[PDB]
Structure formats: structure tokens, C-alpha cells
Ligand binder design. Sequence first.
Ligand SMILES: NC(=O)c1ccc[n+]([C@@H]2O[C@H](COP(=O)([O-])OP(=O)(O)OC[C@H]3O[C@@H](n4cnc5c(N)ncnc54)[C@H](OP(=O)(O)O)[C@@H]3O)[C@@H](O)[C@H]2O)c1
Ligand SMILES: NC(=O)c1ccc[n+]([C@@H]2O[C@H](COP(=O)([O-])OP(=O)(O)OC[C@H]3O[C@@H](n4cnc5c(N)ncnc54)[C@H](OP(=O)(O)O)[C@@H]3O)[C@@H](O)[C@H]2O)c1
Ligand SMILES: [Zn+2]
Ligand SMILES: [Zn+2]
Ligand SMILES: [Zn+2]
Ligand SMILES: [Zn+2]
Lengths: 344, 344
Amino acid sequence: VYPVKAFGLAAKDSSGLFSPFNFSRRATGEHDVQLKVLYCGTCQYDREMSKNKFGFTSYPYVLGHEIVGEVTEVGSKVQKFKVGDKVGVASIIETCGKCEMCTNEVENYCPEAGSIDSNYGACSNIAVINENFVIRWPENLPLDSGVPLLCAGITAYSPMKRYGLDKPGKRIGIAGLGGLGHVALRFAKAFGAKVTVISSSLKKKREAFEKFGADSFLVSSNPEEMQGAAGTLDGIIDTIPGNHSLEPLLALLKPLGKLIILGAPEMPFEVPAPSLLMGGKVMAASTAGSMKEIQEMIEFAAEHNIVADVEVISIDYVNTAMERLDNSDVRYRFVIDIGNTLKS
Amino acid sequence: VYPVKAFGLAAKDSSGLFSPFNFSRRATGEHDVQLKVLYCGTCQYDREMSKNKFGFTSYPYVLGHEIVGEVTEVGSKVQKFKVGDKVGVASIIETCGKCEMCTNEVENYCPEAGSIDSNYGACSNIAVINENFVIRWPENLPLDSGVPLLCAGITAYSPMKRYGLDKPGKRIGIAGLGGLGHVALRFAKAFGAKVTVISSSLKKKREAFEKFGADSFLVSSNPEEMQGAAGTLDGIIDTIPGNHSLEPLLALLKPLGKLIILGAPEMPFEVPAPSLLMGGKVMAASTAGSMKEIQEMIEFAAEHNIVADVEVISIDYVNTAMERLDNSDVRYRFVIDIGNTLKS
Ligand SMILES: NC(=O)c1ccc[n+]([C@@H]2O[C@H](COP(=O)([O-])OP(=O)(O)OC[C@H]3O[C@@H](n4cnc5c(N)ncnc54)[C@H](OP(=O)(O)O)[C@@H]3O)[C@@H](O)[C@H]2O)c1
Ligand SMILES: NC(=O)c1ccc[n+]([C@@H]2O[C@H](COP(=O)([O-])OP(=O)(O)OC[C@H]3O[C@@H](n4cnc5c(N)ncnc54)[C@H](OP(=O)(O)O)[C@@H]3O)[C@@H](O)[C@H]2O)c1
Ligand SMILES: [Zn+2]
Ligand SMILES: [Zn+2]
Ligand SMILES: [Zn+2]
Ligand SMILES: [Zn+2]
């Protein structure tokens, strides 16, 4: 219904099959930033959403919730951005502005928070975003390998800060060395933690040590390895997207330790009361992060040279990438090269 | 195997029936406090243990993990306590002293923590306790109505402080208005919270308002009442000992809110990931509390005149009281008058 021509990829139904899709964006309002999309990260969440895993997908579904681009126009009241600036946008682009969560700068938890993909995401030529939901991209962070910071980076960083899993010398587990996990690992290392990777096989063992500097690696299907590490970890970041038990993770925690649940399985977790009571353990979940947190995160990543390991793909490759995500078959995030491959 | 004659009540088997039982206590060592027991609180945990609910009861089981008494002998190196002092003892009376939890003054989480009831509890004439696990009893706290502070009071206070559910103006739910719950409620009120009681029926509604000053009362099995309170609570103290879902409690929490699980059911909790992810909620369990926390708790209770509502009973009534615990049929804790009713 709007004046600015847009084009990208959309799924028509819960098959999740993407196709070229024409749509539109609002004209640039007084407080808006229009940007040419350069790179669009993608991830398991897009695959899950495209197939309506969570039951809340609206079709047609235009993916794209982690973008970097260059400003093409700003509204008359925008001061902070100018034409040509490199900018990033994460998954939340509107909130109520007036509730407790919004006023306390944790607006990602606004009960009326609006996601970028809810009104056509930004695997597209252009995006138009209120200036309060855009960041200036740091000059020392690559655009292609940095874009997943707007999804994986913030999602890890926010709870790591909130729950105190950001201290040197503590022992932090990362469950699932995937898209989100490899970034969480890099943050934990930069905070000075000793990192244990908890993985479903030995395939990523060498990577964990030689790519990531893990201190130890546990295969979750090896009972002796898991048992040997009982009660050793201060915290665990659980990234696993598929059905799994929390009991083995809780067993790895010290008393008072914290399990942070980021992944979103369809099957509910079965949690015996003693698995928490014995040792007074904590389970917390977390989603995304606030704009204040994203700004802190991106400055921290720039200072510590934290980026993702990315496979840069074309628009035409997206359905292949989606199929590869069904076995997490990427090292470690797909990034779509919009600027060079989306046809105009 | 020890020299000092002791006598009290013990259960022989998982019927949970208590009978007179003779046993012994160690002589008073250099750092020990011998005390004559004056009041022994009892509670659902004693009923549960007496019937082996958790599978770890060793018979004979001498109940009594919350006591107030009077010092009768002190060891040669004891300075803090003197003969005749009124003192309190909670459930943990020995720890390893050298692990991370012990050295950080959270020794109730010592993996080798020793409960008072594990080596014959103190529903008995005499107890002998290392001085580091005894507190001086405040003169302005009644012995009879105060003794449950050493079980219910600490169990509520410790996580309320640890997880920040101790701030004025916050909205705190108490699930299950029983032995533990009524004390937790009183602490919440003293911290300046607005309290919502979540209960299994209307039966305790008048008590909640008139006796406890609750701000609202929700029947958990009334969907309209529960739905009307969605997203309103900063935290919940869940005391429920029987099978229940956490989903309705999580739904009452605001984003970032905290559910504290204190009670201990047989059936595991089923927790859908979205029940935590939506709003970034926290579920923490907790057990007992540390000696440092007990001292702070008892000073807070003395300052704010926090006591339990108790029914003082004789030794001869204990089995009848235990039966009444099966339906929580007490307002709100039984306290055994050892000094006046345990026969010499
Ligand atoms: N909370 C938030 O705000 C937020 C934001 C973004 C994404 N997410 C969610 O986070 C989840 C993970 O996303 P991601 O991009 O990291 O996915 P991913 O790239 O597929 O990585 C997940 C990793 O988990 C492990 N794994 C996968 N399926 C498993 C299973 N069934 N059992 C055990 N381990 C399994 C694998 O690690 P190993 O090979 O080491 O075993 C895999 O590499 C998704 O559910 C997504 O929706 C949440
Ligand atoms: N974590 C710790 O360190 C610790 C320490 C002490 C005790 N505990 C545990 O805490 C639990 C509660 O102890 P308590 O002394 O408060 O017991 P209680 O005096 O029997 O009170 C429990 C209350 O929970 C509610 N309730 C009971 N059964 C229920 C069911 N099946 N479904 C729903 N609500 C139910 C009732 O409240 P309404 O009538 O309002 O519905 C009842 O009054 C026990 O499991 C005990 O072992 C734990
Ligand atoms: Zn993403
Ligand atoms: Zn809001
Ligand atoms: Zn008790
Ligand atoms: Zn210890």
C-alpha cells in the first residue's frame, strides 16, 4: 500500500519455499532512515519462521531481521544519520514507547514490540526504519562478517550482561556450537571466561580448540565425558534449536549456576524439581536485546574484533541455505549479499 | 555411639509413625554448643521425609530441623555463646568448610552439607552443634512463634535477597498460602511489596486479606481470575509441594520477572520454551540459606516483628499433627513445646 518500490524474497506458505516478491515501503517520514540493504544475515530463526514452527507466522513472510546497509535518505527531523552512513538494524524496529519496559530502556521486552519481519523483513533492496532503532556501524567492523552481531551478538550479549556471565575467570559452557553459539563463545572469551563447548559430536572438536580457543569440549552423547564435568560450570548458554533435555546441562552447573535458554524447541522441557533444587540453580530465557545494549555490544565487538564466521551467499542460493539449516550445515552463519546479487 | 544421653521421637519406617526413641550426642568439643531444646518447629518437610517422599530418608528418622533452645555447656574455645543464652539452629549444621560454596559464605550449597535431621534431628531433649551453625536468639522475637523463621523464614528470605524480590513497591506473588507461604508473605510485606496470593481455592481468601493484608487473591483453577492478572508480577514465591504446572505462574510475571521454586513435587515440571522466552523470564530454585543470611534474616524479622502463626503442641500430639499436615490443616505451623512436654 505504500509509495516506495521494494523487492526481495518471500514465503507464500509453511513449506518455507522462498520466491521473488514485490512489495512497498512507506515514504521516509520525518524521523525515518531509508537505507540500501548491503548484507542480510540469515539464520535458523528464518528457517523456523518460514515453516511456521512457532505458530505465529503471517504469510507472505519476507525474511530478514539482521541487516547492514547504507543510508539513502533521512527524514527532515533526523540529525544522527546522514546519506552514506553505514548502519545496522536488528529485529525490533517499533515499540509502544510508554510502558515500563520502554521507559527503562529494555524496550525489546515491550509487550507491543514490533519485529522488523512482522511487516516485511529486510531481505530486500531497501528498508525504512525509525532512527531510534538504527545504529551507526563501527568503522572497524566488517559489514559481511559483522552483520550477524545484530542477531547472534545481541542475543548472547544481553543475557550475559544481565545475568553476570561476563566476568573473567569464570567457567562458561556453550551448548550447541552453531550460529548463535560460536558468537556467544567469542563474547565469553573476550570477557575472559574459560569456555567449555558442549556439542552433539566430535566433528567440531578441532574447530572448538583451533578456531575458537575452547578450554574443553564435551560430547553430549558420551556419558563419561558429561559425568566427568558435573558441577563445574558457572553458567551455560543453551543455543540448541531442537528437542532436548535440560537435565544434562543443569548437571554441569555448580550450585547457584545459571542456564540461559536462547534456543526455541517445539517440545516442552521436562524439568524434575530436584534438577533445580539441588544446588539452587537458575534457568533464564532471553530474547534479542535493547537498543542501549546493541550499542554497547557493537562497541565491545569493535574493540575486541568480534565477528561471525560467515558464508556469503547469493539471493538465488537462499532456498539451498534454508535446506542446509535443517542440519545446521554451515560454518557458521549465512549472509546474503544483497548489494551484489539482488536483481534490480 | 556417644556419651551424652538423648531422647526424642523417631519414625521407624515409611508409614511415618513417630514413637519415643533413645539415642546419644557427642560430648561438647572445643567449638561446640550443647543446648536444651525448648521449641521444635515442624512442617510439611518432616511429614514428607517421614514417609520417604524423596527416596532418601534413612530410618530411624528423628525429626527436628528448626529449633530454639538454651545453652547448657560451651566448649573451651567458644566465646560467642554462654550458658543460659537463648539460641536458634536451622537445618544445616556441618559443611566441608573448604569448597567454593563454603569459602564464599553460601555453605548451605556445599555439596557435602550435613542436615541436622540426617544424624538425628532435634525433636529431642538436647542438641550439640558447632558454634558456627548457631545464632543468638533476639530477645524481641518470641521463641514459640519465632522458631519457624529458622525454616520458613530463611527459605524465603535467602532467594528474596539473592534475586532482588526485596524492594518496595514491587508486586510479589505467593503461591500456596501454607506454612512457608504465610511467612514469605510477611517478609514481602515488610520489604514494602504489594502481595498477590495464588491459592488452590477460595477457602483462604478471608485470611489472606484480613490476617495478612494481601492486595489481591487469585484462585489458580479459575481461568478468568488468572488471566486478569497476566503480566503483573515482578516475582513469585512458589511453595506448592504437590504436582502443578508452572505455566500459569510464568504467565503472571512481567517480562524479566522471576519465579522462585521452593516447593518440591514428584511429577516433573513441563516447561514450554515460549513460557520463558516470551518476556525473558527466570525460574530459580532455592534451598535453605547460609548462616550469614540467617543472621540478617533474624535481625530483619526482629526489627519488623515478623513471626509465624503457630499452633503450639505437645510431644503427645505429634502424630495427630502429622496427619493434619496431609491437608495442610493448621494456621499455619505446628511448634512442639519440648521444654514443657517432652517428659524427663
Ligand atoms: N532468544 C533469541 O532472541 C533468539 C535469537 C535468535 C535465534 N534464536 C533461536 O536460537 C536457536 C538456535 O539458532 P542458531 O542460529 O544458533 O541455530 P544453528 O546455527 O542451527 O546452531 C544450533 C546448534 O545446536 C546444535 N543442535 C542443533 N539441533 C540440535 C538438536 N536437535 N539436538 C542437539 N543439538 C542440536 C548444533 O550444535 P553442535 O553441532 O555443536 O551439536 C547446532 O550447530 C533457534 O531455535 C533460534 O530460533 C533465539
Ligand atoms: N526449598 C527449601 O529449602 C524448602 C524448605 C522447607 C520446605 N520446603 C518444601 O516446601 C514445600 C511446602 O512446605 P510448606 O511447609 O509450606 O507446606 P504446607 O504448609 O503444606 O503448605 C503448602 C501449601 O501449598 C498449597 N498446596 C498444597 N498441595 C497443593 C497441590 N497439590 N496443588 C496446589 N497447591 C497445593 C496449599 O496452599 P493453598 O491452600 O493456599 O492452596 C498449602 O497450604 C514442601 O514441599 C517442603 O518440602 C522446601
Ligand atoms: Zn537471525
Ligand atoms: Zn512499551
Ligand atoms: Zn521445617
Ligand atoms: Zn563445602
